[PDB]
Amino acid sequence: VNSFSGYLKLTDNVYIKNADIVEEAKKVKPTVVVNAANVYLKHGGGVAGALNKATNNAMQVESDDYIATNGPLKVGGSCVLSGHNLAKHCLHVVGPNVNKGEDIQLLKSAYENFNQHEVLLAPLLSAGIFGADPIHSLRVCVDTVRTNVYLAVFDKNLYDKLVSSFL
């Protein structure tokens, strides 16, 4: 039993809720919150900009030190950093950005990072300003992630479309 409340169960291991991932992170304090990162960990907008704002820019400061030491991530890759005031850890995962021409097949590789964590609060990878179809992203999530994932979908209309179209 965990403290995530009000989720609809999609499969054995995937749950979904119309929620602001920032507010959900502040209330649950999960072990892992997933960020929709880019390879430079420049948290300007979308989920990343919101999570970073909620940390008063501490996420960005930590991220800049990480990049200065290690260089950029790979598209499809990830790193574990602090969750600051939102979670124990933040798993920064880089899904492909369609608005940069990146290969959508890398979306499965991106979701594979979730399997290294038993439970996660996460957004749909490559959705929103990353330009992928969120229905496709949800399908890849369900078919790739085997650990327990709680998906927060900010947009109520997108949320009900995701639920109503889910196979």
Ligand SMILES: O=C(Nc1ccc(C(=O)N[C@@H]2c3cccc(O)c3C[C@@H]2C(=O)O)cc1)NC1CC1
């Ligand atoms: O600002 C915040 N939270 C905040 C939370 C999420 C986002 C964001 O970009 N969401 C994206 C979106 C939007 C529309 C359609 C989509 O497919 C997606 C994918 C992605 C998602 O929903 O996961 C932005 C901001 N909180 C403080 C109090 C105001």
